Every structure is written in C-alpha cells, then in structure tokens.
Design an enzyme around this catalytic site. Structure first.
Site, PDB file in Angstrom:
ATOM      1  N   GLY A 194       0.787  -1.239   0.000  1.00 14.27           N
ATOM      2  CA  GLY A 194       0.000   0.000   0.000  1.00 14.27           C
ATOM      3  C   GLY A 194       0.817   1.286   0.000  1.00 14.27           C
ATOM      4  N   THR A 195       0.162   2.400   0.331  1.00 12.09           N
ATOM      5  CA  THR A 195       0.828   3.689   0.470  1.00 12.09           C
ATOM      6  C   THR A 195       1.144   3.898   1.942  1.00 12.09           C
ATOM      7  OG1 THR A 195      -0.543   4.575  -1.344  1.00 12.09           O
ATOM      8  CG2 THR A 195       0.725   6.169  -0.024  1.00 12.09           C
TER       9      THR A 195
ATOM     10  N   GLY B 182       6.225  30.017  10.664  1.00  9.92           N
ATOM     11  CA  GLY B 182       7.506  30.314  11.293  1.00  9.92           C
ATOM     12  C   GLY B 182       8.099  31.620  10.808  1.00  9.92           C
ATOM     13  N   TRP B 183       9.275  31.937  11.346  1.00 15.81           N
ATOM     14  CA  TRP B 183       9.957  33.188  11.059  1.00 15.81           C
ATOM     15  C   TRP B 183      10.126  33.462   9.554  1.00 15.81           C
ATOM     16  CZ3 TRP B 183      10.578  37.281  13.987  1.00 15.81           C
ATOM     17  CH2 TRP B 183      11.491  38.279  13.590  1.00 15.81           C
TER      18      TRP B 183
ATOM     19  N   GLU C 117       4.335  35.097  12.214  1.00 15.15           N
ATOM     20  CA  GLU C 117       5.244  36.110  12.729  1.00 15.15           C
ATOM     21  C   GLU C 117       5.396  37.241  11.723  1.00 15.15           C
ATOM     22  OE1 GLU C 117       7.350  32.372  13.826  1.00 15.15           O
ATOM     23  OE2 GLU C 117       8.822  33.831  14.553  1.00 15.15           O
TER      24      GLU C 117
ATOM     25  N   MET D   9       7.286  33.238  22.923  1.00 15.93           N
ATOM     26  CA  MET D   9       8.659  33.226  22.418  1.00 15.93           C
ATOM     27  C   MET D   9       9.506  34.235  23.222  1.00 15.93           C
ATOM     28  SD  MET D   9       8.076  32.815  18.310  1.00 15.93           S
ATOM     29  CE  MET D   9       6.952  34.192  18.244  1.00 15.93           C
ATOM     30  N   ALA D  10       9.809  33.841  24.454  1.00 20.83           N
ATOM     31  CA  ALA D  10      10.538  34.670  25.396  1.00 20.83           C
ATOM     32  C   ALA D  10      12.054  34.559  25.172  1.00 20.83           C
ATOM     33  CB  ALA D  10      10.143  34.304  26.837  1.00 20.83           C
ATOM     34  N   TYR D  11      12.459  34.886  23.956  1.00 21.45           N
ATOM     35  CA  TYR D  11      13.858  34.852  23.580  1.00 21.45           C
ATOM     36  C   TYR D  11      14.063  35.730  22.351  1.00 21.45           C
ATOM     37  CZ  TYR D  11      11.573  30.826  21.276  1.00 21.45           C
ATOM     38  OH  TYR D  11      10.704  29.981  20.635  1.00 21.45           O
TER      39      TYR D  11
ATOM     40  N   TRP E 250      13.119  26.094  21.963  1.00 21.57           N
ATOM     41  CA  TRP E 250      13.646  26.078  20.592  1.00 21.57           C
ATOM     42  C   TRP E 250      15.158  25.943  20.707  1.00 21.57           C
ATOM     43  CZ3 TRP E 250      11.955  26.522  15.487  1.00 21.57           C
ATOM     44  CH2 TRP E 250      12.965  26.679  14.533  1.00 21.57           C
TER      45      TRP E 250
END
Ligand SMILES: Cn1c(=O)c2c(ncn2C)n(C)c1=O
Ligand SMILES: Cn1c(=O)c2c(ncn2C)n(C)c1=O
Length: 388
Positions: free
Chosen positions: A67-68, A95-96, A136, A202-204, A343
């Site tokens: 199959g697939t 994403g960015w 973003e 996103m605390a960076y 991240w």
C-alpha cells in the site's frame, strides 16, 4: 495532571545537525512542535520537505510494504507516540521565514477554510495530535481579527474531524506568540486565550545584530542598573498577556537552547564589533557547545539572565544555563503558567545538563493528557494501522 514541556523539532535537523526523532527525550516531552509546514496565499498548507517529512527510510524501514505508507520523521514520531502516551505531536505551520503568506491566507472565508481543511488533512494523515500556527507577525487590526477567524475555522475543522473519525478526541490548537510589545499589542489576546489550548510565548531573541549594544536575549526582568542590556523582558510580556485576560495556565514559557553572541564588547549593554561565527549561522551557538573554554558563566539575578563572558576575547554569549532554567520555572510556577517550551531540540545537552530535562525536573510531573493513536481516515496504511 502535570506541566507542559513543549519542544521544537525541526525537519532540517536531520541533515547537517544529524538529529533524528529517535534522539528526542520522548519520555520528558509532552508536545513536539514539528516544524515547519509552508503555506500559499490562498491558504493551502503544504510540506516544505517531503523527504524529511515522509520519504526518508531509516534502518528499520522496508522498501516493499503493501500500500501507500508514511516513512521519514512522520513514522519516527508516531513510533514515539506509541511508546510515550503523554507525547503529543503538533503540526507547526509557518515560522519566522514562512510567514509572508499569512495575511492573505487569513484574509477571506475561502482562504481560511482552505487553511483549516489542508492543515487538518496533514494532521489526520500523519497521525498528529494538533496544529500550531506560527504567524510572525500580524501587522494590522485586520490581520489580528483575521487571525482569530482563522484559528476559529481551524478549531471548527478539528472538532468536526474528531466527531467523524476520532470519537471526540480533543485535538489541540496552539500558537507561537510574540514577547515584543509592538507585536503583542496588535493581537486580540483575550480572544486568542479563549479559542486556543496553548499560547507558546517566544521569550527569547530579545537581543542580537539589530541592536546598537549587546544585551540579554531571554531575561526575565528589566535591568534597572543597566537598562540598555534589557530592551525587552519576559515579565512585561507575561504581565501584558495575563492583564489582557489570557488564562495563565494556557501560557507556556519559551526558552532558548542556544546563545546569541556579541564579539568585541565590554559586557552587557556595550558596543560590540560583530556577532561573530556560530554553530550553523553567524552569531548563534548551540547550547551543547556552551560555555566555551576561557569564558565564565555570569548570573544577573536582578535581570534574571545568564550569559558567558570571555574577558580575553571580549565575547558575551547570552544563553540559558540549567540553573537559569530552574529559576525561570520557579518564576513560571509563581504565576501559574502552564509549562515550558524550547527552541530547539537538536542543540540540547544530554543527562542532567539537558535544559529539556532540567525544566521537567523543576516542573515536577509531565502533562498527563494522552495522545491519539487512532487515525482511521489516514491515506497512509501503516498510520491507519498504528504501525501494528
Ligand atoms: C526560525 N525560528 C522560528 O521560526 C521560531 C523560533 N521560535 C519560534 N519560532 C516559530 N525561533 C527561535 C526561530 O529561530
Ligand atoms: C527577533 N527574532 C528573530 O530574529 C528570530 C526569531 N525567530 C527566528 N529568528 C531569526 N524570533 C522569535 C525573533 O524574535
């Protein structure tokens, strides 16, 4: 029961970084933010790397299955889901780099429906537990309203999919969220808090090449003694989100598994010559290579930041140590935030110096929410059979 420990796993990490899904601390993670899917202006979500996502054959994989069938990271992550029931896999979109089409994708009822319908299609084919939208960033009031509409349409699609094919399993919906006021002040925060399961802050990336002076990239608090070192702060962001009516329990505290370098600098809030070299791009170092020989690790308890400084090379690297992660979790606990996010996976140390492991140890027990192992509508035969 327990706390969220969410970790970005990039599909390009399988090349040059040689970081495969099997290398994750799967028993210590409740959400894998599998990154990234791309999107068109008309809302169509699509794989940006079908080899990494679906086609790469690991040593365990057969060429002659019936199959697939799904291979690549998708099959690898599903394997982990079977073995680790608190491990949810989230489909991260945008994403960015791939946020340019979001304004258009969110712009009409038709484009939002397409985004819903194509996003959930991947989730239900790939055997994932939810969708994470990383736009973003919304620029206008129109974008902010459209973002809410988009997320509501995705929520609708998840709910209807589940009623038909998952016996009411609650698939999840999250976003990566800005810690910069110029961005978060645009968002419809209360409305986002209502519709979403989680908001991953996103605390960076608070400091880098775009600054005239070196700074802390991920500090908890404003520095009163040296404010040029703290153009942002986690506290200002978290306070803004909570004051807006976002439930604290839905806010997940993002933390970096990398350092941002300032080379030829007297210290935080100085003049610097260059961001210098990096692990994979200029001025950014994998946590697993920090600190470097010749550098001392400094803690600024008032700013709530760590960094290495080498006085001979006059190099500052802003990153989080394990004891910084402990401090951040303690701060998060005080506010009743829902957990931690990182991240990204590939850069982490092993054993106790793992930031991902340190966070869980500090948090206590892992989010007990069970993943889904039932995908009867998957176009992949092995996924529909739960690799059984
Ligand atoms: C490229 N990129 C992202 O796309 C991203 C991120 N954190 C969240 N997102 C979505 N980081 C640190 C990042 O480097
Ligand atoms: C400033 N900045 C970046 O430059 C960035 C990012 N993610 C990736 N990059 C490159 N984030 C979240 C960010 O705030």
């Amino acid at each position: 029961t327990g706390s969220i420990n969410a970790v970005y796993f990039t599909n390009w990490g399988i090349y040059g970084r040689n970081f495969q899904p099997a290398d994750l601390q799967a028993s210590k993670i409740l959400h894998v933010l599998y990154s990234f899917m791309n999107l068109r202006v008309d809302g169509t979500v699509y794989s940006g790397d079908t080899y990494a996502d679906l086609e790469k054959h690991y040593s365990d994989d057969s060429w002659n299955d019936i199959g697939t069938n799904a291979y690549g990271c998708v099959k690898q992550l599903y394997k982990l889901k079977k073995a680790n029931r608190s491990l949810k896999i989230m489909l991260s979109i945008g994403g960015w780099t791939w946020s340019t089409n979001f304004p258009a994708a969110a712009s009409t009822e038709a484009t939002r429906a397409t985004f819903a319908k194509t996003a959930v299609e991947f989730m239900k084919d790939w055997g994932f537990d939810g969708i994470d939208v990383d736009w973003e960033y919304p620029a206008s009031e129109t974008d902010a309203n459209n973002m809410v509409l988009l997320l509501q349409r995705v929520r609708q699609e998840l709910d209807s999919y589940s009623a038909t094919y998952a016996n009411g399993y609650h698939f999840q919906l999250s976003i990566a969220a800005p810690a910069g006021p110029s961005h978060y002040n645009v968002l419809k925060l209360a409305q986002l808090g209502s519709v979403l399961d989680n908001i991953n802050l996103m605390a960076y990336d608070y400091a880098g090449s775009w600054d005239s002076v070196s700074g802390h990239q991920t500090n908890l608090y404003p520095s009163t003694s040296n404010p040029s070192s703290t153009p942002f702060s986690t506290k200002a962001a978290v306070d803004a989100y909570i004051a807006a009516g976002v439930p604290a329990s839905k806010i997940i505290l993002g933390m970096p598994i990398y350092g941002r370098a300032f080379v030829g600098t007297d210290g935080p809030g100085k003049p610097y010559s260059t961001i210098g070299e990096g692990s994979w791009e200029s001025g950014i170092w994998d946590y697993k290579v920090l600190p470097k020989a010749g550098a001392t690790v400094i803690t600024d308890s008032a700013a709530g930041a760590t960094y290495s400084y080498d006085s001979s090379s006059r190099t500052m690297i802003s990153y989080d140590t394990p004891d910084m992660v402990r401090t951040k979790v303690s701060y998060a606990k005080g506010l009743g935030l829902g957990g931690s996010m990182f991240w990204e996976a590939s850069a982490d140390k092993t054993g106790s110096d793992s930031l991902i492991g340190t966070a869980l140890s500090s948090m206590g027990s892992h989010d007990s929410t069970q993943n889904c192992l039932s995908y009867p509508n998957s176009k992949f035969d092995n996924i529909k059979n739960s690799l059984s």
